[PDB]
Every structure is written in C-alpha cells, then in structure tokens.
Amino acid sequence: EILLSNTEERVRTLTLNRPQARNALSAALRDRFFGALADAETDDDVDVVIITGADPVFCAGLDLKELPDISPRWPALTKPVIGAINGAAVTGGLELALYCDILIASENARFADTHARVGLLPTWGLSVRLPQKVGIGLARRMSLTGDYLSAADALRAGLVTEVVPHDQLLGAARAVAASIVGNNQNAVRALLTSYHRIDDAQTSAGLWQEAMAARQFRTSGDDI
Amino acid sequence: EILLSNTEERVRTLTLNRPQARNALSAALRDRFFGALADAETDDDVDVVIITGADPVFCAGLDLKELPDISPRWPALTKPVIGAINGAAVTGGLELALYCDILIASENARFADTHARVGLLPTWGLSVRLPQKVGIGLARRMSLTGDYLSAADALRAGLVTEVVPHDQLLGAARAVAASIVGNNQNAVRALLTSYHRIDDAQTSAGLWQEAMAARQFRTSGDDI
Amino acid sequence: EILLSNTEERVRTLTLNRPQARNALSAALRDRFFGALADAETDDDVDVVIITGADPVFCAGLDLKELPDISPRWPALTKPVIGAINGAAVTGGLELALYCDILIASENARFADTHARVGLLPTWGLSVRLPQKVGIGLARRMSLTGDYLSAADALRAGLVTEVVPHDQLLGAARAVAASIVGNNQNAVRALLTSYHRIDDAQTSAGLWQEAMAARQFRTSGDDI
Amino acid sequence: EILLSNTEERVRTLTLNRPQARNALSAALRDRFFGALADAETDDDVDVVIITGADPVFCAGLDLKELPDISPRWPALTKPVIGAINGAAVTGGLELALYCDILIASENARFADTHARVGLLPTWGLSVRLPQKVGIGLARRMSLTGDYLSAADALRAGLVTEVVPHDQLLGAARAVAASIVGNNQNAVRALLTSYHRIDDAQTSAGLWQEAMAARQFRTSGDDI
Amino acid sequence: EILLSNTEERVRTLTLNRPQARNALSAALRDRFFGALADAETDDDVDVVIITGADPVFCAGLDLKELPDISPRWPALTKPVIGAINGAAVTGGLELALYCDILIASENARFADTHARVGLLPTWGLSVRLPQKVGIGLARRMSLTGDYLSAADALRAGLVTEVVPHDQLLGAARAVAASIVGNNQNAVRALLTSYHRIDDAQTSAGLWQEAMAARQFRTSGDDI
Amino acid sequence: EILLSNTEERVRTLTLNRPQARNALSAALRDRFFGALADAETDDDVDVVIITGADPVFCAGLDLKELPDISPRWPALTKPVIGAINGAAVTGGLELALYCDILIASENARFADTHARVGLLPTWGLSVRLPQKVGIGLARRMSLTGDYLSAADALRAGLVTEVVPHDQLLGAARAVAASIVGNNQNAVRALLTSYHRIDDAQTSAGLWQEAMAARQFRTSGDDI
C-alpha cells in the first residue's frame, strides 16, 4: 500500500502513498518505487509512466528520521516518465521530479531544495538538473535559501510544461500520455533513448562531481 | 520561383515559395535553399540573412511524398540568420527555424515536431537544438506528442525573441537586421563566429549521437 | 571612495561608486573591486557578497577613454555573490552581472552588450554566460544589435530571479542573503563550490575559445 | 565468396576475400561486411569476432574506381572485435583496423593513410581514432605524408598489441579470442559495452567534426 | 601492522602489509589505506607519498572472500603519489596503481585485470584509467582476457615510467620523491593540483558511466 | 639576425638564433617568432613550416632575466609545423616543441620542464599537451622533478616520431616536409585544419584551467 500502481491504456501510474508521512521516501518506499520503474521498463504492455503522490504532498524527500550515503537508483528507461506534481516536491522529492522527462503541475505544486538547510549534499542529481531545468540563478537561489518556488514561477522558469487546476492534474497527465501512446512507439522509444543519450553525455561529468562533493562532505563531517 | 531572394541594404531575405505545398522542402527546394545560404556567406554585399516562408505556412517540413537518409546541409556561416516565422514550422521546418541565430514570430506562428508521428528520427539537429532552445521538458513533450507550440508559448519558452502582429513580421526582422548592419561588421562577424564555435563545441557530440540514432533506426527498419 | 564596502550580519556589500562616470571601471576601480572580492573570500566574517552600483547606473562597462588586452580577474569564490542591479549594466558591466550567482533587479535595471558597437570582443565571459543565462537567440540578438534588454524581459528570460521597485532593491538582496546566512554554512559553501565546479567544467572550453577569439581580433586589428 | 565467414568455438572470423583487388571494399563487399558484423551481434552463438583479409593484403581501402559521400556503417557491437592484420591496411582499410577493439599484426602488416594523396577526407573515423591509437604526432605524420608505418613501429606506437610471424597470425588471434570466451560473458559484454560508452563520449564530438569537414570539402570541390 | 607507514625527508611511504593474503584489501586495510592518504594530505611535513606492498605482491585486489557495491575512496590530493610496484597488481590493486601520479616498477612487477574473470565490474576507475595509461587496445585485451602484462610491456605501453632491479625499487622511488621535494613546493602543489583538475575534467564523464555500468550489472545480477 | 628564415620548395624554415643565450626567447625573439608563424600562414608560397634552433640548444625557454603574465601567442595555422629539435628544449621551449604538429629529434635532443624548479606555472599549454604527448605519468614525473627526458625516451614515449644522427636532422625534416608538399594541398590543409579542430575541442577546457591556475598562482604570489 505504500506505492500504488495502475495500468490503463499502456500508461502505468505510480502513486507514492504515505500521505501521513508526506510521501517521504523510506527505505521500503525507495525499494518499491525504483523497483516499479524497472518493472515498467520491462513490461511490454507499458509505453508511458506517470508518477504522482497521494495528496496533499508530492514528496517531502527522504525519510531522514529513519536514516548517510544515499546512492542514486533511477534506472535507465527507454520510455517517457511524466511527473504529475500534485503538491510540495522537496529535496529528494524535487530530485524525483527532476528525473522526469516531462512535468505537469497542479496549482498546488511547489518546489524546494532544503539540502543546505538540513546539512546534506545532493546525490540524486539536483545539483546538475536543477540549474539545467530552471536556470543557474534560480537554482542557486533555491538551493542556498531553501525557499519554495511556486507552481506559477516553476512554469515561468521552464521547470514544468503546464499548470492545471488541482482536480484536472491526472487527466492532464493522462492526455499527454495518450498522445504519446498514439504515436509510433518504435519512433517514440528510439527518439527518447537518443534524447537521454544526448543529455547523459552532458550531465555525466556533473553527476560524478556531485557524487564526489557529497562524498567529501560526508567524510569531512566525520571530523566529529 | 520555388525560392525567392532579395537583397536590400546589406540584408538578404530568402523566401520559401511553394505555398500550395505548404513550403515543403522538395529536393529542388533544398538545393536552392542551402545553395542560397552558401552564396550569402560568400557575397560581400550581405551582412545579414532573413529566412521566411510565403504565407500561410513557414515550412511544413520535407516533401516526404517525393522521398530515407536525409543528410544535414546547413553550411558554416559567419553572418547572422534571422528566421521570420510567419506560420507553422513543422519537423524539418522546425529544424530550419532551430538553425537560425535569432527568431522573430508572427502571432500566426506555431511549432511542432511530428518525427515520431510519421516514424522518422531527426537528422537536422532537432534532438540537440530543441531542448537547447525550449528546455528539456518542453522539447520532450513536443517531440513525443507531436502537439503544436503556440507563438505565445514559444516566446515564453525562449524559442523566439519576439512575437509581432502578422503584417509587421518582415518589418520587425528588417529592423533587427538594420541594427546589426549599423554596427562594426568586423566585430559582428568575429563575435558571431565565436558564438558558433562555443556552441558547436557543446552540440557536436549530440549531433553525432543524433546521426547515429537515425542511422540505427533506418537500419533496423530494414528488418521488413 | 570609488568602491564602498559594508559588512553587516555576515553580508558584505560592495558598491561601485563613480556615479559621475556611470560607475565605469577604471583601472583603479578594477583593482579595488577584484581585490575586494578576494578579501571577501578570505574574510571568515563574510558568508555572502552583494554587489551593486551607486545610482543611477549599475555599471556602464570599462573606462575605455582611459585605455587593449583586458584579462579576466573575477576570482574563485566559495561564497555566493548576489548582484543587486540598480540600473544599466552595459558590456563589461553586463559581464560583472553575469559573474554573479544570483541576480535581483530594480525596475530601473537594463542590460546591453555594446562590444560589437564599440569594436571590441568580450574577455570576461559574456560570450559564454549570456547565452547560458538568457538563451542563445536573445544573447545573439543582444550582442549583435547592442539593444537594451528591459528589467521585465530580463526576468522573463531568466537573467534575474526577481524585479523589485527601485527603493526595495537592497532590502530584497539583503533578505535573500539573510536566508542564506541562516542555513548551514558548511553545506552552503560545499554546495556552491560544487555548483561552480559543475558549471566551470561546462564553461571552460567556451571561455578559452572566447579568449582566443579576442586575441585573434586584437592581432588582426594590428593590420593598421 | 567476396566475404568468408567461419564460426568456431563461439568465435566468428570474417575474411575479406577479393585478394586480386587487394581486398578493396566494393559496394558489395561493404554490404556484406557490415551486414556480417550486425549478424554477429545478434547471433547468440558468437562471443568474439575476428576480422582479417585474404593474403597478401589486409585491406587496400575503398574501391575508388567503382565510385563521393561514404557514410560510416560500423554498427554498435557489445562483443569484442579482434583485427588480425595480415598485410597492408590502407586508408578505409586502416579505418577498419581502427574500429577494432584489439589488433594483432603479422610481421607483414603495414598501415598507411593515403586520404590526402588521393584528395579525399576521412569519414570512418580515421581523423579521431588514428591520433587516439598512435599519438597526435605520428597520426599527423602518417596522414600528411601518406607514408607506411611498419608492423614494428605500429607495435611501438600502441596501434597493435602484438606482432607475430605471419603463419601464426590467426592462431594468435584465436588464442586471445579463446581467453575471452573462457571468461564470464555477462561481465565481458557489460564491461566492453561500458568501455565503448566511455570512449564514444570522448569521440563523438570529433566524429561529428570529421563528418562536417568531409562534407565541406566535398561541397567546395563542387566549385569545378 | 596491516599498513606500515614511514616519514622520511618529507616523503611518506605507505606499505600494504598482509603478505600472506597477497596484500588483499580487506575492509580494515581499505580503511587504513584511504585514511592514511587523507592524513598525508593534511600533514604539513609531507610533500610526496610513496605507496608499495610487502613482497612478493603489490596488491592482489579486494578481499572478495570477506565481502557487492564497492565505492571509490581515493581522496582529493594536492601532493604527488608515487606507486612503487614491487609485484603483481591485480584488479582493485591495478586500480590503486592507476590512481598514482607516477609509477616505477620492479622487474618483478606485473599487472592484470581479472574483473571479467571473477564476474565483477570495476568501480575504482579501471575502465577510464587503464585505456588512458596503456592505450585502448591493450586495456581491452587486458580486461577481456585477464592476462598478465609484464613489467617490460608496462614500460613499453607507458603504464610505468621506469623498471628497476627489484632491490633498487624503493631507492628509485625515493630518488624521484627527493627531486620533487627539492623543487619549489608552492609550484609543485599548484601545478599538480592543476594537472589533476585538467585530468578530472576529462575523466569525470567516464567515471560516472563506469559507476552506472557497475550498478546496472549488480542490479541485473539480482535476477537470481 | 635573432630569427633566421628560409623558404625553399614551399617549406619555410624558422631558426631561433641567439645561441649565446641558448636561444632563449626574449621579448624581441618572441615577437619575431610568432610574427613569422603568422606570416607563414598568409604566405601562399608556403605549405609547411619547420622550426629549429641554432646549435647546440633548441630553446632554453623564456628570457627570465629580461622579465610575469606570459600570454599564449601561437597562432591558428592551417599548415603543418614540423619541429626539428636539435638540442635541449626546456620549459617555454618544450612548449614550442609541444605546439608542433610533428617532431623529429637529433640524438642530441633532450626535453625538460623546469617550471616548478623556477617557481612559475605554464601558460603555453605544457600542462595540457605534455600529458597528451608523453602520457600522464611521464608528464608528471618530468614536471615535478624537472629531470631531462632523453631523445631515445622521447621516441619511446611518443613525443617525437623519429630520432636521427645530429647532422641528418634538417634533411630528415625536409624529407617529411617534401612528402607533404607532394600531396594534394587542398586535402592536406583541410585534413590538418580538421585535426586541429578535433584536438582543440579536447584541449580547450584544459588550456583555460591552465590559464586560471597560472593566474591564481601569480596573484597569491603577490602576498609578499
């Protein structure tokens, strides 16, 4: 029950479902989520994935209480992942949003990076993909302040493709997924795969640097 | 008559002129267009190029009926190319727009990538330059859906620098070209050349990957 | 008196102060400014730097009258620099703005690149960072025309994070700086340092090309 | 008969067999060779490929008589290709050797790049992979002179891993292939695939530049 | 006693000392070794580090019996590390050798990569640094065969700078370290740091790809 | 007389001629040398350049007595430069050798990097091109020790293509130049230009980092 899954017309929707913990990613939820992404890749009945959260929060981040060296786990996918951001997407949860190919946001969406507030460095690509998707200045402002970015500003900045009234969110994400499903899937997958290969070639160096920064930070922190 | 050309105050305007075929790029029009770009480069009376289409469409893409391994042909230019997008710019036509240094759009402009609809992969840089100029999420949404991007959204996303009423389009493009012509041309050409060299260094890897993806797609398609 | 400095709650504000020369960067002001940035880095009482100009101009650029091979001098910093753009930021002054981590603009702000007007090529990163922060098309339009970009367009394009009424400018910059100061400084500095390392890895090739273009331009200019 | 093929203990040996035309790559031989590489990839009974030529020449290059825009065709492989160089490997034939993962040479081997002699630019990666595998100075010396590199110098320069007496060549290549076959194939293929991905990330930009240089050369040549 | 350490004339020598386990890197030895490298960096009495092993083996690799996700731990150093390779350097031990700035080898030295034999992928940079330091062909031959590279071939290939009689090894390494100590240390450290920054910029993308390949391999292996 | 020049059969030979100062590069000699390279590029009677020194030294480096911020000046050339290394090539002189496309060495040749001995960091590409042309380990050994590399080791390492008896040096360089002159010059220049563009794309980031390291070193040195 901590992860819901639904397959409908070649679209798999994955719903983070720990609303009482604001969909925080416990170890168990991590295992289920990343496992579900991998299963979607290998499932020949799935063309598109939608990820979302049970209201009122998209994902508050990692369950820090429960836990640190937090390795990246988002798998190589050849199928598009649409993030239907229904609420706050914070830190590790902002990183889940940044992994998506396409984002659509409820008016209730908001985005924040609290890594520096809580004294952790990112290891799931925030430091590469946030400046890539909202611009250097805004990424730096977000990360260093830990302030919320509204849905409207996220749209202005290019973080999301659309903002809809809250109750239309999953419909809006399904409509985009249906447009994709209706196109030539050999071409969709080949073109997405290529886009990922073009992007990876540009992000790889950064992701390594991010990893090494996090490691150095953790190690120096063990001067205590 | 399939390509019009006009030189006025050191600005060469090239107009795709097959309006009845929505300015689709036949083999002949390709030869004329790319040939004209090359001639503009070597013509010492030209500082700036404007490309546009006969109404109501900018360019509907390659003439697919007539035709496939479609090699890139846009030449090395040291002079700025302004695209005056007067209508729909689709697929290969969106790639012509993405090659321009600067875009200005009529309110009647719209942009779409139908490669995945029609079962072709891009070979004129769409997969590199679309995410570069409208952002990763929007590029992926466009490519995988094949949906139109409006003139206003194109402006919001950074695809175009300006949107004007339809009848002001060529005037708006000429005004920008005149501002350029009025500056130090040695500096204009040296600075543009450098901008192109800086950009090429970042896009080259991607363009190769795009080419290889297209090739692999074509070859696997010859499992039929 | 040509550079003012003030330290307050772990924020150092540096004010270019030659308003009668529109804060043009003379040799002396360059020495003071870059020297002050370096001192801020080594000063353990400073977490954040704000740069601004005495009204009504942010910085009109280098003092060209007084002067050319103008080497880059902005030092390696591990602390964030917020640019509080109070007025026109032109050419070398636009480059000072482009060096900042975060920009906030008065409604009175405007941005222009007159390098090509005045027959100089950039050597302080404009040709790398302008397309990075406002997009390729707009950067090329700005550089080749030398036209002003308004505060509102700068906000739309992602050049600045915010635009405020003129009298609120320094308050708005101090509020952002205070949010940063209130977070874990070990994390702030480590994350910023990493962001800079990720970015430098992407800009280095471009900056070298910019330098070489400027050099070739200067050398060919000595065919006179 | 223009391409021989043999499968033995999970090793596929492909022999260019037009010895009377010094194994020149006609259109037909190209189709057969590249087709055979692709079939080896998909053949689950093959772990390793050896390529070689019927004596006394490895490959004299493309059949130029018969033919120009010569697109690259070496496919994505996840299996190692050992080149057993039995004689001269010239121009397009040197490029076939440079595509191999591992080279072993007969004492009778020699290598030359005659592209500049014959007025053609490379399109099968010579200009990237020759400096990569023999060093910048030697690559430039080879390409600009068109002089032969001996087997012994090829060994000194790192172009080949070993040089054997002529009659031991295929035995030496089979021994290496047998060592590979005897290791964990899941690991062999995963590690090779990774090596290729690491290398491609470094060569892609170069290969694009090579392609564009060749194109510009061909186009300017059509000023005649 | 599992790691020996000695400081003499501003040179710290670290000796792996589990000769009965062929200096295999247990968890404890890993902690001691990487900890010692970090301490050398911060120790103001040390200019140069020499790493070596108790005879007859340099390092047989990780203690696999004892153990898998084996994260990289070699720290950022601004001081040169000379590897005095006294015997076999295998797999993880070859990676320790590949991390060194400079290698000198006993005649008794040999090098092998058994990752593919033992069904593991590298995570300490072998897949980036082996082709960098011995050339693509030889790296691929080594990795896929798991065959030993002799001291003499290692010298021919550029893996080591020198090969000495066994009893002269540490003297030869101390002589090089003494030459370094005798030069301007501010310059030595600044130049080394720069060399590392130049190299890291080229290896980072590869190291990320290596990490991701290893992860994917481990995850697929958990289909069992 | 400080620079000799000779044109013979489309080969321009430039001889550094301050043998009493071991061909040290004074300001005047720098101006003449770099000026001569530029003139060779524009001279339509020249296909190839040979650089050499009056015996017994190739180039001892910059005239340090006479002088520091030493900017790079080697121009963009589309014609090959062969370095005929007749004696010691030290520091700035090793950098002149590293700029050449092809090197041939007298038995009397030797190479050294004394930057760290004399407390200077390189600004003419040593820190990029030395590891590129002799391998990382040997470059680091050379730079940090300041020890001489013999002609024979230079040949083993790939720094030079050939080593000849002293009296045959210029004949050997002329023979290579004659082979180049005898090939299709349109192809020679196009292929060389491409090789330079492929290489520049890989070295640019490094050269920027080198420049920034040198600058930081000079600036910190002004803590005195």
Ligand SMILES: C[As](C)(=O)[O-]
């Ligand atoms: C350390 As994390 C998963 O919040 O980037």
Ligand SMILES: C[As](C)(=O)[O-]
């Ligand atoms: C194959 As096309 C010219 O539409 O990118």
Ligand SMILES: C[As](C)(=O)[O-]
């Ligand atoms: C030459 As400048 C400091 O205006 O980029």
Ligand SMILES: C[As](C)(=O)[O-]
């Ligand atoms: C044009 As060719 C196949 O000899 O590189």
Ligand SMILES: C[As](C)(=O)[O-]
């Ligand atoms: C997994 As390992 C430390 O042998 O590269």
Ligand SMILES: C[As](C)(=O)[O-]
């Ligand atoms: C500072 As220098 C010309 O010896 O690299």
Ligand SMILES: [Ca+2]
């Ligand atoms: Ca299913």
Ligand SMILES: [Ca+2]
């Ligand atoms: Ca943007």
Ligand SMILES: [Ca+2]
């Ligand atoms: Ca004309």
Ligand SMILES: [Ca+2]
């Ligand atoms: Ca203080």
Ligand SMILES: [Ca+2]
């Ligand atoms: Ca079979």
Ligand SMILES: [Ca+2]
């Ligand atoms: Ca080598």
Ligand SMILES: [Ca+2]
């Ligand atoms: Ca001590």
Ligand SMILES: [Ca+2]
């Ligand atoms: Ca002449």
